[PDB]
């Protein structure tokens, strides 16, 4: 079986240039790669927060160290997601916030600290879960850096960056290593009798041929959905948000500092993201069209940040769900042309490089053994489903009942059996779980606990086992005190996030 | 909710004393534990090989180091399973053997050495997979120790031991730390209107009461099956063997040495185990009653080892399957009273301490929250199913067609969708996967490859990706050469298994 020789990527967004970079890297020899992107169809223009796997899975694989790509794309640090006004009836006189922190929660004699915390709360302990079980939240309040002045990491973290800059940075990297860039527009996809893609017809009359096609054409899915007619499974019965009004907002970094985390500010009919970096923060009101109008949501967004009726905006709508099959015949969909959940928790770009990782692990020859694509397609479903569960958990758990949108999340969502089971185990007092392993069950006990406890849904009781383990309870107190010590050191030890980034220019 | 106070274990076999030890360990305080065992109903008398998790999960948890319990139970080392006459038509003039080795196979640029080996075999490379991808098989042929004279580990391994001695060793350990032993026989189990166990009536007239009951009564399942009437799911449609004829056989260790591995010698209608230790080896012909008679199988067993018609034997039959629920109301089944697959691959005792681990992780209070047992019961099904897949893979993969029994394994077995999927991925050329994580997918790429390749079922082709990675192919050759070096060092470096064990008395 002859190997793949010519690859064509359709799309010049983040997805296409990640695909181009990764593939040019994975395929040392016998690989000609061409990417074509329409000068007249813009990128989506968002996608600026991430999760920890980005470096280990994507950039490391490219051989691009964190200190090299960060300053090139206005990179900033994301130590958490701060959730604001999610907990219940928004009250401007009450501080309703909680963090979803990255990183592992320690175990004490095989039991997560979360569960010793719950036991204490039962005895009247007032401190919130994440402030007792992690050392860094207080520092986040102080908008400090996730690492020392000298660059030594001090807490688990991901990244923020400029979406357009990232795409451009990879475009340069990829082109430099042999990727052929073509600024042009596909207008016809031709299929042989078998149903495979033979070539693309462009607006300037070019005919592009290839063995393998990567569809990174974004939500229109030029190859996978339209040409190959693979159905998209709409899942707006699982999740309500289908729109966003977004913009970049200037920040007075000198007076207000740079927050080392993404913020999720709950709204009337959705929520608003805040992704800070030097000079400004990306922002966007994610909402459901069925509970508010774009006009109405736009006014809410402008009001939230005190913006003016002249502020140019990025109006977006998106589909929620996944292709029935991500890879069909000789076409692999990657990016918005494949699956999407709303930007809560930031899984979009992870879907890109996780899919690319799976693609290489299932790489075909020109005979396109269906066993390979089927195995690939099944991994995508798992990856997507795991995240859909976690995202959904932010919603049907809410105690907010003040608008139709929150009522609908409370009562009207379709839930997978998988999330039902986890919730049932959680409520019973049981701990949840504590790359290939990461792609696998990426969201652990700690993550679900940050969310559930932040939202004010606690288990029915502490673990029955703990009543037999007074020693263990004692050791846990020691671990709590230790955490409290580290928290204090960091306060006087970490530079401000603002100052640290500036020291990176 | 009041905690559990009184626990009664029924059964004095390996299962009961593992339960008693583990529980007395896990439950520091507020735990009274009584074990009752009928002097007139003997233990099963087998169960003498194990897998690597035994130490980390069971003995370590007890605080009993390997050097302390081994000499107490005639412990020996198990570095592998050697399979003899499994490959095809048995021919006394052909050496048909292969090893299933414990331990991980190295990865080269994210691809297991197994797959680089396959690529070489395609070019005419003659050496067998396990001799190229692991350093220790040749040493096993030489019956060497898995560690240096001084006791430094040199290869991954599990253990062999005397079944009765192990049970007795734990009995002493457990009794010494507060377990109450009662030599007596349960004759009636009394249930309240709710259907929970109130107490046990013994033959001497004792009435035993408790909050929690552990059923370790072996295959009769005195509590779970008979009293509580939980159905046992027969799975002799998944696996054919239902009987064994066993005995201990003296060995001339001075002239023949001690093999550092379990042997699996395929027979006409089953297979025969060889579990060596100092002085003798446990052995047993596992067979299907539907393809040979006990009388016939007995004669085959005696002939295999040159035994005499006077040799006293352990005649066994066993059920294959699992309880519909391992834990029902206030009764947890552990051991042969719960699930069993035939002894191929040695999962029996693993089922014991893995279940005990899950029991403590789901430990109840006296209200017996059904969410706990349901979560427990589901983990048991996963554990069992994963092993049933792996065991089944030894059979429907066989190329032997010389008896009805092998024909039946070839064509007539009921296969899970899970094993079908793995096989399909394997055949396509894809790698398979590479405690809580162990219980999870304990059988990895290497294990399945040892088995499949030993049995002579290879993938349809090498990984398409490798054609683009000449560099990677090169590095793999280096790794192969390195493995060959270590193999040579061990040959001149390891003491004989026989000599090493003797140095332990
Ligand atoms: C509101 C919103 C918020 C998000 N927030 C996050 C986040 O916080 N974190 C995160 O990781 N992800 C996020 N995502 C997802 C993320 O934005 C995308 O995964 C990422 O930006 C890559 O998108 P893309 O390249 O597939 O699509 P696009 O940006 O839409 O790129 C499409 C490309 O295909 C080209 N193209 C299309 N059609 C044709 C044609 N017929 N001929 C030629 N060329 C063509 C276009 O010109 C363009 O270059 C968010 C998405 C949305 C919608
Ligand atoms: C042929 C064969 C080979 C095996 N090989 C292996 C192997 O290689 N590796 C491995 O790990 N496992 C193996 N196993 C499994 C292993 O033998 C068992 O898991 C282990 O020995 C524990 O068994 P048990 O204690 O549950 O049952 P048993 O040994 O049958 O113990 C039963 C106990 O319950 C008591 N009892 C019963 N009934 C009553 C009553 N009404 N009143 C009072 N008391 C009572 C009995 O007196 C006895 O003490 C094998 C099993 C078989 C059958
Ligand atoms: Cl996202
Ligand atoms: Cl077994």
JSON list of N, CA, C and O and ligand atoms in Angstrom, two decimals, chain A residues 340-343 346-348, ligand 3:
[
{"chain": "A", "resi": 340, "resn": "UNK", "atom": "N", "xyz": [-18.15, 21.17, 18.60]},
{"chain": "A", "resi": 340, "resn": "UNK", "atom": "CA", "xyz": [-18.06, 22.33, 19.49]},
{"chain": "A", "resi": 340, "resn": "UNK", "atom": "C", "xyz": [-19.05, 22.28, 20.65]},
{"chain": "A", "resi": 340, "resn": "UNK", "atom": "O", "xyz": [-20.22, 21.94, 20.49]},
{"chain": "A", "resi": 341, "resn": "UNK", "atom": "N", "xyz": [-18.54, 22.60, 21.83]},
{"chain": "A", "resi": 341, "resn": "UNK", "atom": "CA", "xyz": [-19.36, 22.97, 22.98]},
{"chain": "A", "resi": 341, "resn": "UNK", "atom": "C", "xyz": [-19.10, 24.45, 23.18]},
{"chain": "A", "resi": 341, "resn": "UNK", "atom": "O", "xyz": [-18.09, 24.98, 22.72]},
{"chain": "A", "resi": 342, "resn": "UNK", "atom": "N", "xyz": [-19.99, 25.15, 23.87]},
{"chain": "A", "resi": 342, "resn": "UNK", "atom": "CA", "xyz": [-19.72, 26.55, 24.16]},
{"chain": "A", "resi": 342, "resn": "UNK", "atom": "C", "xyz": [-18.36, 26.72, 24.84]},
{"chain": "A", "resi": 342, "resn": "UNK", "atom": "O", "xyz": [-17.79, 25.75, 25.33]},
{"chain": "A", "resi": 343, "resn": "UNK", "atom": "N", "xyz": [-17.83, 27.95, 24.87]},
{"chain": "A", "resi": 343, "resn": "UNK", "atom": "CA", "xyz": [-16.47, 28.23, 25.37]},
{"chain": "A", "resi": 343, "resn": "UNK", "atom": "C", "xyz": [-16.28, 28.11, 26.88]},
{"chain": "A", "resi": 343, "resn": "UNK", "atom": "O", "xyz": [-15.20, 28.43, 27.38]},
{"chain": "A", "resi": 346, "resn": "UNK", "atom": "N", "xyz": [-13.26, 26.18, 28.13]},
{"chain": "A", "resi": 346, "resn": "UNK", "atom": "CA", "xyz": [-12.24, 26.25, 27.06]},
{"chain": "A", "resi": 346, "resn": "UNK", "atom": "C", "xyz": [-11.74, 24.93, 26.43]},
{"chain": "A", "resi": 346, "resn": "UNK", "atom": "O", "xyz": [-10.54, 24.61, 26.50]},
{"chain": "A", "resi": 347, "resn": "UNK", "atom": "N", "xyz": [-12.62, 24.19, 25.77]},
{"chain": "A", "resi": 347, "resn": "UNK", "atom": "CA", "xyz": [-12.23, 22.90, 25.21]},
{"chain": "A", "resi": 347, "resn": "UNK", "atom": "C", "xyz": [-12.00, 22.96, 23.69]},
{"chain": "A", "resi": 347, "resn": "UNK", "atom": "O", "xyz": [-11.58, 21.98, 23.08]},
{"chain": "A", "resi": 348, "resn": "UNK", "atom": "N", "xyz": [-12.30, 24.10, 23.09]},
{"chain": "A", "resi": 348, "resn": "UNK", "atom": "CA", "xyz": [-12.23, 24.24, 21.64]},
{"chain": "A", "resi": 348, "resn": "UNK", "atom": "C", "xyz": [-10.89, 23.89, 21.01]},
{"chain": "A", "resi": 348, "resn": "UNK", "atom": "O", "xyz": [-10.81, 23.04, 20.12]},
{"chain": "C", "resi": 3, "resn": "LIG", "atom": "CL1", "xyz": [-14.07, 26.54, 23.87]}
]
